[PDB]
Ligand binder design. Structure first.
Ligand SMILES: NC(=O)c1ccc[n+]([C@@H]2O[C@H](COP(=O)([O-])OP(=O)(O)OC[C@H]3O[C@@H](n4cnc5c(N)ncnc54)[C@H](OP(=O)(O)O)[C@@H]3O)[C@@H](O)[C@H]2O)c1
Ligand SMILES: CCc1nc(N)nc(N)c1OCCCOc1ncccc1N1CCC(C(F)(F)F)CC1
Ligand SMILES: [Cl-]
Length: 163
């Protein structure tokens, strides 16, 4: 059972300049709660983007997807494909794919749940941005209310399940 979890601007941006181009503490808390104790699968660029204090993510089984043979990711398990990441030698009840755009596209056919934070931030996409997946008609969801962050941004959470 594989879920994707991401935060996106309403315009669909998830990443810029090797990071996330807004600050949304309530999203960090949401992400922390959903993933603690579970497996988190990420692309190598997302692994390299992590803040020092969260590389690896504490209290979670970190898995990093790369084409590099012999890459070492201290504190994580390195695998060579998303399929390998979803075939662990030690099964986990809950596996979360935590980005980025390349790994989400590989993961979406294998997933049955998406947890999406939508951020009302004016971010006209730029040419090198990482963009969110778009969920087609095989997905249906439920939306929480629009809330205001202590940071000032409006945001809301969506939960999708494969039909
Ligand atoms: N807003 C959010 O929720 C969120 C979440 C996560 C990340 N982000 C942002 O998104 C950006 C990073 O995303 P990204 O799309 O650029 O990168 P990414 O998906 O995190 O990682 C890409 C890397 O994954 C590996 N990879 C990709 N396809 C593969 C395949 N078929 N087999 C094996 N390895 C494969 C490659 O690593 P190698 O080059 O090592 O071979 C590739 O360079 C950053 O800006 C980050 O801050 C945002
Ligand atoms: C939070 C950002 C986030 N939101 C949702 N809803 N889905 C995600 N897939 C996601 O991206 C997680 C991987 C990238 O993560 C970060 N990128 C930049 C800055 C900070 C982080 N975080 C902070 C929390 C930290 C902790 F370990 F505490 F969880 C992990 C690193
Ligand atoms: Cl944490």
């Amino acid at each position: 059972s594989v879920g994707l979890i991401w935060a996106q601007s309403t315009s669909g941006v998830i990443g810029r300049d090797g990071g996330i181009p807004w600050r949304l503490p309530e999203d960090l808390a949401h992400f922390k709660r959903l993933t603690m104790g579970h497996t988190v699968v990420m692309g190598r660029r997302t692994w390299d983007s992590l803040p020092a204090a969260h590389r690896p993510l504490p209290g979670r089984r970190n898995v990093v997807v790369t084409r590099q043979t012999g890459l070492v990711a201290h504190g994580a398990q390195v695998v060579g494909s998303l399929e390998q990441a979803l075939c662990p030698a030690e099964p986990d009840a809950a596996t979360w794919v935590i980005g980025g755009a390349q790994i989400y596209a590989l993961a979406l056919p294998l997933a049955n749940r998406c947890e999406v934070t939508e951020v009302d931030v004016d971010l006209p996409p730029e040419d090198e941005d990482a963009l969110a997946p778009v969920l087609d008609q095989t997905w249906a969801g439920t939306s929480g209310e629009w809330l205001v962050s202590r940071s000032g941004l409006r945001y809301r959470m969506h939960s999708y399940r494969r039909l």
